Amino acid sequence: LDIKFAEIHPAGYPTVVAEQNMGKKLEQASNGDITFKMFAGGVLGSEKEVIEQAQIGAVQMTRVSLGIVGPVVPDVNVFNMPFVFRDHDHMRKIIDGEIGQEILDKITNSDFNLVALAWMDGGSRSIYTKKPVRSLEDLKGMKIRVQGNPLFIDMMNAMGGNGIAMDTGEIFSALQTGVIDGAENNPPTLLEHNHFQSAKYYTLTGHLILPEPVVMSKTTWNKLTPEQQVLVKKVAREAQMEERALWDAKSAASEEKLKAAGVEFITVDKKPFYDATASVREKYGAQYADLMKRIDAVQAENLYFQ
């Protein structure tokens, strides 16, 4: 059984490395009965195009941002809301515990032919722009690229900007020409997708912390034996933990490289951004009241139950 794994990120990126190591484990443990090949750098298309391919079995596995899964499986949008997690460490507790399992299961048990197996870390997303944004007010009227999810367009509009949905690969040229004034992402993406060449101001809003599911086509999943399925579950969960260490290293390295390239990291009070997005959490969070209560209550400890 052959697995093609699609990635939007370039070779060497922390997700890519963790995933190729996971694939090596699959090959070794199955004595070659499962083979694995990585297709990085967006060679198999945009994240939305790849998810479509996974649904019909043309691509066997991928990792994508949860941001673009929302339009396919609405119930995952609980993790896509602005400031749903208080910080990066809080998100990690969630994806490692019971609520993380529940949300993976909402993808798997959906009618959309995907099996969700683990969560990769993509840090926190902050706004980078061609001109400095030092306050909520400075964002007014700016065209900021977001991922293709109505939630993020509403979010950016609530912050007084103009959210423009675009595929990952379209951002570089749109920035170069001023078709957009900025975008929002973590430091490794800002660096490794070369967006810093056009945007030298990075405002640390941390407005989203979007986990990234690793998914398999359910068509492919159903061709595995139960023992192979257990192997896949095991090594996917191991990859969630391995990628965390790679992520922390890469994020810190990327921050330093970006500063050396002349990117200014601008600290801001998050409160005005939190307040501006209350309407978005009210709109999209109405049906997630219980989950939000449970998420908010995860704090000092590291329990599984939440």
Ligand X SMILES: O=C(O)[C@H]1O[C@@H](O)[C@H](O)[C@@H](O)[C@@H]1O
Binding site for beta-D-glucuronate: what residues are annotated? 47, 63, 125, 145, 168, 185-186, 212
Number of H helices, E strands in the chain: 12, 11
Binding site for ligand X (CB under 6 A): 8, 47, 64-65, 122, 147, 168, 185-186, 189, 212
Closer to ligand X by Cβ: residue 185 or 306: 185
Strand (E) or helix (H) holding 208: strand 201-208
* Binding-site sequence positions: 47, 63, 125, 145, 168, 185-186, 212
Q: Rounded distance, CA 63 to CA 211, Å? A: 10
CB of 64 to ligand X, least distance (A): 5
Strand (E) or helix (H) holding 54: helix 47-55
CB of 182 to ligand X, least distance (A): 13
Closer to ligand X by Cβ: residue 14 or 298: 14
CB of 122 to ligand X, least distance (A): 4
Closer to ligand X by Cβ: residue 35 or 197: 197
Exposed, middle or buried by CB within 10 Å (0-12, 13-18, 19+), for 160? middle
CB of 33 to ligand X, least distance (A): 30
Strand, coil or helix: 228: helix
Antiparallel, parallel or unpaired: β 201-208 and 125-129: antiparallel
CB of 227 to ligand X, least distance (A): 31
- Token look-up 């001109």 returns 131
Count other Cβ atoms within 10 Å, centred on residue 105: 12
Residue nearest to ligand X (CB): 168
Closer to ligand X by Cβ: residue 34 or 51: 51
Q: Rounded distance, CA 286 to CA 21, Å? A: 40
Closer to ligand X by Cβ: residue 30 or 196: 196
Q: Rounded distance, CA 80 to CA 64, Å? A: 13
